[PDB]
């Protein structure tokens, strides 16, 4: 079963299970392994595991991290993934003084949206986009990882698990207690992360659901039935919220050309209906350089 693989070094143990970097002895093939201890489980193979497997089976794309095999031995399951060296937070951290080249920001954001555009058209939400779950290789690629909190959406979506997404990267519709939800939650994550990449500092580091909303508001402006129909009737909306003026985006992310600063605003529209899509983001002038259009049959 596992006889060709030499654990070289462990790279992480969190909400994912265990994860060691492996060697293929005969090949010099470097993969990532996720170990799942089956014995420990009362409830058999975890819910989160059965999902992340069958999804990644049918989510083959260059900006998604690739599942390569599934191996069962001795009351231990092994997921075997395409391997990348660094994660986008430790990178963003390493380049906290120097800045990140805007060439590379743009390039990276692009590749993420292609991954997301792929998932969404495959009718799948990530629901835990965060620099920790964005992996970069040495050839300048970036790729979505960690589909444990992902979930397909029956095109007429139904009610999904309320509390998802790490607080900071979490979208105002989930915080204000929205019933149904869809693709626009992933975009807000990516928008937080764009701004992160620019300012090498998280856009909304809330220490609570209350702090997170207020931190958002202080930057985007206390929202009303104008900028976001429904907002006022929504469950965790209180008429008590203070009022803050939206701010100039030239201050909130100073380094960013109008082409960026626009894009970002549409990614952080309050109204999920109006929020930009993955596919449409690719169209934006910001990618004028990497944008190369095609024709359109009617």
């Amino acid at each position: 079963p596992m006889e060709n693989f030499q654990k070289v070094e462990k790279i992480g143990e969190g909400t994912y299970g265990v994860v060691y970097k492996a060697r293929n002895k005969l090949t010099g093939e470097v993969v990532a392994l996720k170990k799942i201890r089956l014995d420990t489980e009362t409830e058999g193979v975890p819910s989160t595991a059965i999902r992340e497997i069958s999804l990644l089976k049918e989510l083959n794309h260059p900006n998604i991290v690739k599942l390569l095999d599934v191996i069962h031995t001795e009351n231990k399951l092994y997921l075997v993934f395409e391997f990348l060296h660094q994660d986008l937070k430790k990178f963003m951290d390493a380049s906290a003084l120097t800045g990140i080249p805007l060439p590379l920001i743009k390039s990276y954001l692009f590749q993420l949206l292609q991954g997301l555009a792929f998932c969404h058209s495959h009718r799948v939400l990530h629901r835990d986009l965060k620099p920790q779950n964005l992996l970069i290789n040495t050839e300048g690629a970036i790729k979505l990882a960690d589909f444990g909190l992902a979930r397909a959406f029956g095109v007429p979506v139904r009610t999904y698990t309320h509390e998802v997404v790490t607080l900071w990267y979490r979208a105002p519709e989930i915080l204000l207690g929205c019933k149904y939800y869809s693709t626009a939650v992933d975009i807000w994550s990516l928008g937080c992360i764009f701004a992160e990449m620019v300012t090498r500092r998280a856009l909304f580091p809330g220490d609570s659901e209350i702090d997170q909303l207020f931190r958002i508001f202080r930057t985007l402006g206390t929202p009303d039935e104008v900028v976001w129909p429904g907002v006022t009737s929504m469950p965790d909306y209180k008429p008590s919220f203070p009022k803050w003026a939206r701010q100039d985006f030239s201050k909130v992310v100073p380094p960013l050309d109008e082409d960026g600063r626009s894009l970002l605003s549409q990614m952080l529209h309050y109204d999920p209906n109006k929020r930009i899509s993955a596919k449409a983001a690719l169209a934006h002038p910001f990618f004028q350089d990497v944008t190369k259009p095609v024709p359109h049959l009617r």
Partner: protein, 272 residues
Amino acid sequence: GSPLPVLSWANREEVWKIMLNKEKTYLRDQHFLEQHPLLQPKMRAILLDWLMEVCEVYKLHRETFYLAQDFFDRYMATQENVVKTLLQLIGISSLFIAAKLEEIYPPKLHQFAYVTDGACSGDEILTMELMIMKALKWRLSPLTIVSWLNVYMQVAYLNDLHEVLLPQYPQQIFIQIAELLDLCVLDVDCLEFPYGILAASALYHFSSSELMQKVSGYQWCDIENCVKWMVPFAMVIRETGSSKLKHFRGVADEDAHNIQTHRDSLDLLDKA
């Protein structure tokens, strides 16, 4: 041909095609019970009817149900020569995988053993779930018979902003159609017809080939076969009168139509 409106998140044709391309990769064989020569059709029927009952009592999702069916019928066509005794375990193992997949708060392993009245214990189920999952090759994301009916019902209520995400459609009509499919599935010859069409077919029986077409895309011809095959099963639903949407105080309201249900259907499948 795609009956989806101009989508915002992706290319309506792109989305529909992926969905279609999916219903290939996912394969079924109406005549798989010949590889198990000692196995009879009328068996499969009673098992599926059992699973429904259990799905009801635990307020499981129809979707969960159909994931069970699908895991069963796909798995068996990877197997050879199986005994009637084994089928109680293979079905409720199937369901367990689904429940884990579809519910937020799925039932616990013992409750799943429980129902077997000893004949299957949690440890057996845990072994099975793994032979099944390695035998479908971890392909547990099929578009289900009911999955389509939800699509079609949503596409039947367009309004102005062609919003295909917020479910906006009447429960009693959904329930009434489900009832017809939830039968049709008991006879193995349905695997002949793709789930797209079975769902179309049934909707036509409660509507017309004009709605069917604007919701599904399928042309009167594409279905005629299964609407011919399905005729018998329709009469019986019509003869008895069609069901009232019930409420289960566990379950909210804007989900009550999605909760799987039961009625003898023994007497009813026979009448074809």
